[PDB]
A paper describes a structure:
We have determined the crystal structures of full-length [name]-[name]-2 [name] (residues 1-601) in three different forms that represent different conformations of the ATPase catalytic cycle. The [name] form was determined at 2.4 Å resolution with two [name] molecules in the asymmetric unit. In addition to the specific changes in the nucleotide binding site detailed above there are also significant domain movements that become evident when comparing the various chains of [name] structures. Firstly, the Zinc binding domain appears to be fairly flexible with rotations of 10–15° around a single hinge point located near residues 104–105. There is no obvious connection between the conformation of this domain and crystal form or nucleotide bound status as variability between chains within a single crystal forms is equally large as when comparing between forms.
The [name]-[name]-2 [name] ([name]) has been identified as a target for anti-virals due to its high sequence conservation and essential role in viral replication. [name] contains 5 domains, a N-terminal Zinc binding domain (ZBD) that coordinates 3 structural Zinc ions, a helical “stalk” domain, a beta-barrel 1B domain and two “RecA like” [name] subdomains 1 A and 2 A that contain the residues responsible for nucleotide binding and hydrolysis. A long 30 amino acid linker that does not adopt any secondary structure links the 1B to the 1A and 2A RecA-like core [name] domains.
Numbering used by the authors:
A (entry chain E): 2 to 187, 192 to 336, 340 to 593
B (entry chain A): 0 to 202, 207 to 593
The structure:
């Protein structure tokens, strides 16, 4: 017995076919079962046929026979169907309300989350359907990992490479950071690993958790936890105040953070606030300066990824008292220059999924484009705060929707925060890029930021572009372009000053091939977000939708502080690059 | 001609913009608004607005003055003078009766774009009707003039009557060697030269197909075939007129049950001025267009379309149902391309006239049937209404099928609502008629494209053939001068071919003709391209996606590609997106 998810009317009915088993009242449960393939209704007892050996569980074929339930072939004379007059029979049938958005619920409840419109709907529906979609989406993700085969250790080459055997028949998962395995030995549980495909032979690369000498015969399954029910909304109702409510602003604010004076004020005069901080505009600067402007404020700094949390720590290590900070870590080697798992310190740095239950004066949520609605709900459910600051850039990378194979997910459907930034606009917008040369800045400014991103630097005259399709050779789940490595290898002898450049490409395997030939430090576009380097060498590798994504390209070319070389494959993005075109050797 | 009507507000003028490839007439007001907000500074009157001093190269109208009785710059102007471009106007005739425009912004973006972005065509299909025509002429003249920028090819070595080696001019670009780029061949004689027909190339050597058939020698050279672009006058669509009863058209008393499921649509045609027909693959567009004449047996009908092959298919259908003495196939004497020869030639007054848009005469008709409307541009639509003053207009085609190859468009994807005016109505307000039953394809293909591009409104006639297969295999992509090559994908078909020998009757279809050429060397099947297979049908089809690019993943291209099969189809897919949309049987990769 609980509350219907659509209209909160109390009910004893749950849909036995939905993966979340939501509470649906008599009318909502009717409108769900008649227009979907979901027919199993659970109550204080399941709505199945009470006859010996009968397997009729379809509620639309079931009848209320006194106290029991029956199909047509086993019903008593005095009986009527459970589904009639727009209601499924159940407790509190007289006290129903019904809903006006059952249509969206049906599509959320029955989709397989492979289409982009499944995520669009999960972000344009009501708040209670946003939580149900996140539960159902994550439950489908965890369940779908069951179909992937187990990874058997075929050979242990080194402490960082090995050979894997794959189960015949069952599909194989893409080997990157998004897929996390659990290792067994036959009876110990070996640990928690990830995989990546290098360049030497059939060998993969592993980055494990608990140290262990894994032997031939060990098998890796996949890391699947349990999806917890959501209770808190993605965004609490916005509260506006005319004075700074709940905070004590300082009057001796240093020069470094005086430009953001009209910003932390807005943080104090609102319940939540959204700041869009494009690359190199001092996002982390704004976040840390909030702590100095409100020096007594207990502040929780959180993000999804460990690297985004660690970056906030390295910036905090410079301007904040070390003993008043803590890095919350769950049982990846992350920031380790604070005191670990000290929940009560004034400044808490912690990933979303590992957050504890506490309160705070201000909560800062960074890298908001990487956040899912599930994450937004968890933050509100774990952190009771006077002010929530959501920091990120909808024109940067989103969370990896592993099931999404059909369609393109636009930034306004990443989460509730990104949706507001793309519709009513963000509350604050850091519009001066102080990292990149004018060529890069002006390129992304017209590419994603609608000419709002301004350059604090001159043209560097060291940003070059080259159109050179080359040869694309794919492997197990990545792409490789050696001819594009060939151009860069040529470039590194003609321009020996660029030997200090970082190689960036949309693919892990090409980076390993880049490392093998060039020797440059390699970095995927995913792991490069929130980072900066003087020189950057980028090969687009392929002409796919993955390497042509403008958000991925925005992050890629905005890693440079001095110069960049873009070996391009797609015509449009090359023609949109405001760089000096180079002649093909 | 120095005097005409302003292209924006129709006021008479003695001014034309010399920087615009079309030299449109612009009034005193419109000319000023155009020159001051763009880089177009050359204005033409009876004489060009340029400085007439010995040795001066000043041609900016904003730096010139009318002095004495000529045009001079600031350095050379006589004391008594006045500026040519000032006070909101460029000087010229009828300076008191000018109207001006409300927004030249659309005209300026049409007149200064390079037509390499998809947004350039979006504007060309959303502007006012007079700007659609100007944008049609501007795009078309840009295409033809850019053709002249390519280098000339020369035969250096002949390998057979199919393959030959080409020599190319140094320093000039070389055209992509596909079926879209047609060349005019030339052979050298004692003096001068002579034209030896038209040719297309494919795939280090190339394979050629000619309008005629010579055993061409070394030294023959090919220049991309260029065409002049006439000015446009008529709209892309006539004004709409819904009538109370069937006007100018008389139904038949009894009718065949071949075209019985079209009687509702046939009456819809006869009560509104123009009408649209969306007909998916299979379906039977030509059967409908011909049966329309049997419902109004006395109606004069002009069947038109862009390509000769599209007009030829209507002739073959009319040969089966319409009197042959009632049909005339119009063939322009210019360019003698092999077309339909079973009808009398160039009889404009015949009851059934079959003619391409480019060769249309100036006549009238009870009904005009414009077939394959997705392949048309707004230029074609304007020509049809300028040459053919009809009583009804029926546009047949499919917005989900391929459009005219926009050769200049290399950045962005053009959506069906921006193909032309007719597809714009079909994609927004919906087509007047829809043929919802597909007779050609096995049910797997039909349910796919019905859920892919047809809103599940396309109904399968056949059953599940159980011979529709799909494989996910990216393989190895290699590029050459103008296409791509996926040898591992062809090597995948080879293991499949020796496993299923009956599939040697299948047609090979890949988005690029380079991958096609390599298939006819390891496999052997007859190869086609999605654009070179539109309209026709085959038993078995073997499709290799080759790449994951926007060209290989175009939903319209993939819609046409997979709907060429009557029985079975094998898809070696690169895109996970379209692979998962294919309701086919999957296979493991050996
Ligand atoms: Zn359900
Ligand atoms: Zn309810
Ligand atoms: Zn029963
Ligand atoms: Zn002009
Ligand atoms: Zn005018
Ligand atoms: Zn002069």
């Amino acid at each position: 017995v609980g509350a219907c998810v659509l209209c909160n009317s109390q009910t004893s009915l749950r849909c036995g076919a939905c993966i979340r088993r939501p509470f649906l009242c008599c009318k909502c449960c009717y409108d769900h079962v008649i227009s979907t393939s979901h027919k199993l209704v659970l109550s204080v007892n399941p709505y199945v046929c009470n006859a010996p050996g009968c397997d009729v569980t379809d509620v639309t074929q079931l009848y209320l026979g006194g106290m029991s339930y029956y199909c047509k072939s086993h019903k008593p004379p005095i009986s009527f169907p459970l589904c009639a007059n727009g209601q499924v029979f159940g407790l509190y049938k007289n006290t129903c309300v019904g809903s006006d958005n059952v249509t969206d619920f049906n599509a959320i409840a029955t989709c397989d989350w492979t289409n982009a419109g499944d995520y669009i709907l999960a972000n344009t529906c009501t708040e209670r359907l946003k939580l149900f979609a996140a539960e159902t989406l994550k439950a489908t993700e965890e369940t779908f990992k069951l179909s992937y085969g187990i990874a058997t250790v075929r050979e242990v080459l080194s402490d960082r490479e090995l050979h894997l055997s794959w189960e015949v028949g069952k599909p194989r998962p893409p080997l990157n950071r998004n897929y996390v395995f659990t290792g067994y030995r036959v009876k110990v549980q070996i640990g928690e690993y990830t995989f990546e495909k290098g360049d030497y032979g059939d060998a993969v690369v592993y980055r494990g958790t608990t140290t262990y000498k894994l032997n031939v015969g060990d098998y890796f399954v996949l890391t699947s936890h349990t999806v917890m029910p959501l209770s808190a909304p993605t965004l609490v109702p916005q509260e506006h105040y005319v004075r700074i409510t709940g905070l004590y602003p300082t009057l001796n604010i240093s020069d470094e953070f005086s430009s953001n004076v009209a910003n932390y004020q807005k943080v104090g005069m609102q319940k939540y606030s959204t700041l869009q901080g494009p690359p190199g505009t001092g996002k982390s600067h704004f976040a840390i300066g909030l702590a100095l402007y409100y020096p007594s404020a207990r502040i929780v700094y959180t993000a999804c990824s460990h690297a985004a949390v660690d970056a906030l720590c390295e910036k905090a290590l410079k301007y904040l008292p070390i003993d008043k900070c803590s890095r919350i870590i769950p049982a990846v080697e992350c920031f380790d220059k604070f005191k670990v798992n000290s929940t009560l310190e004034q400044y808490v740095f912690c990933t979303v999924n590992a957050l504890p239950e506490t309160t705070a004066d201000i909560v800062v949520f960074d890298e908001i484009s990487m956040a899912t609605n599930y994450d937004l709900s968890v933050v509100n459910a774990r952190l009771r705060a006077k002010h929530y600051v959501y920091i990120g850039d909808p024109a940067q990378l989103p969370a990896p929707r592993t099931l999404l194979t059909k369609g393109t997910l636009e930034p306004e459907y990443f989460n509730s925060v990104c949706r507001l930034m793309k519709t009513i606009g963000p509350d604050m917008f850091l519009g001066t890029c102080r990292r990149c040369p004018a060529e890069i800045v002006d390129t992304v400014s017209a590419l994603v930021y609608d000419n709002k991103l301004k350059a604090h630097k001159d043209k560097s005259a060291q940003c070059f572009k080259m159109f050179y399709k080359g040869v694309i050779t794919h492997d197990v789940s990545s792409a490789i372009n050696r001819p594009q490595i060939g151009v860069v290898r040529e470039f590194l002898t003609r321009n020996p000053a660029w030997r200090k450049a970082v190689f960036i490409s949309p693919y892990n395997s090409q980076n390993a091939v880049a490392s093998k030939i060039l020797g440059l430090p390699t970095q995927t576009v995913d792991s490069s977000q929130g980072s900066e380097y003087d020189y950057v060498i980028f090969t687009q590798t392929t002409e796919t939708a993955h390497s042509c994504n403008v958000n991925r390209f925005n992050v890629a070319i905005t890693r440079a502080k001095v110069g960049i070389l873009c070996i391009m494959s797609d015509r449009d993005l090359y023609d949109k690059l405001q760089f000096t075109s180079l002649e093909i050797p």
